[PDB]
Design a binder for this molecule. Structure first.
Ligand SMILES: Nc1nc(Nc2ccc(S(N)(=O)=O)cc2)nn1C(=O)c1c(F)cccc1F
Length: 288
């Protein structure tokens, strides 16, 4: 509906974040011009092209097709510049990314909270899988915090729909330290490579985003911090194929590390499902 969010009533409140190809703003949609209205987040392209606009349309369709408690809510589209451009309207989550939240609000984070967030992420990913969507960018920087009891998966800019006849999508066009080995070596993405990335997400959570413990910092320390360019990927592949893995974070229960290591299976079909993982995590919590 092109009259639902008219550019003239979308009022700027704050800049939230700019990347190479996207920017997000906090705005208030004020149809009565009474300095009220709903607070929303507005995503727009940066450095746009016809191909990026097309991908942006697919991203908007993906988000609109999702209705789940642990997925950022779609609100609509603004057809700005006299209906010659597109902006995506979605819900605004006050506490930002989970990565920043873990750094900033460690005073209210403990293992119980970490496993609650883990559970909610798994459920959101179960939901995504029923649409046969592959997120391809799961990371705590892309999970958002509504409040201390609720997180939601966001940033569907890399999300692909499986072909009807296949259980993987082959990208022909990269957060390499969250990638499964078969994504690095064959460009194959699947629910199982999303489960690999989720193991990296679980690792991040239990590192509490301490300095020098991020997956890039740890992998680079293992590979050699001097390495530059493609040699980095070469070494990353060789490491992963022969069982090199992120270490257990200090303070991390062996049981939780074992979840990480089972997600990090080189054998694509032996990784657990998101339903397995949700049940296992909620049973750990309920058994606690
Ligand atoms: N829908 C949404 N809500 C927010 N909340 C937010 C974002 C940033 C902050 S900040 N600058 O650290 O204080 C605080 C709250 N982000 N968000 C997004 O889609 C979003 C994203 F996915 C990636 C980058 C930026 C975004 F904006």
């Amino acid at each position: 509906d092109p009259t639902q969010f008219e550019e003239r009533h979308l009022k700027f409140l704050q800049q939230l974040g700019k990347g190479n190809f996207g920017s997000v703003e906090m705005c208030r949609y004020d149809p009565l011009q009474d300095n009220t209205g709903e607070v929303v987040a507005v995503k727009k392209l940066q450095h746009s092209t016809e191909e990026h606009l097309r991908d942006f349309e697919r991203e908007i369709e993906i988000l609109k097709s999702l209705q789940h408690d642990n997925i950022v809510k779609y609100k609509g589209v603004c057809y700005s510049a006299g209906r010659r451009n597109l902006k995506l309207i979605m819900e605004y989550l006050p506490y930002g990314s989970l990565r920043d939240y873990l750094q900033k609000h460690k005073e209210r984070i403990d293992h119980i909270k970490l496993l609650q967030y883990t559970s909610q992420i798994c459920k959101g990913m179960e939901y995504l899988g029923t649409k046969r969507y592959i997120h391809r960018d799961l990371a705590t920087r892309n999970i958002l915090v509504e409040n201390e009891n609720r997180v939601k998966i966001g940033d569907f800019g890399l999300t692909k729909v499986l072909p009807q006849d296949k259980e993987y999508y082959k990208v022909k066009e990269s957060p390499i330290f969250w990638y499964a080995p078969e994504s690095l070596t064959e460009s194959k993405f699947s629910v199982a490579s999303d489960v690999w990335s989720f193991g990296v997400v679980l690792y991040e959570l239990f590192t509490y985003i301490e300095k020098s413990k991020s997956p890039p910092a740890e992998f680079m320390r293992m590979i050699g911090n001097d390495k530059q360019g493609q040699m980095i990927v070469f070494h990353l592949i060789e490491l992963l194929k022969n069982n090199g893995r992120l270490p257990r974070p200090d303070g991390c229960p062996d049981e939780i590390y074992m979840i990480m290591t089972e997600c990090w299976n080189n054998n694509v079909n032996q990784r657990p499902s998101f339903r397995d993982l949700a049940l296992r995590v909620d049973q750990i919590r309920d058994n606690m």
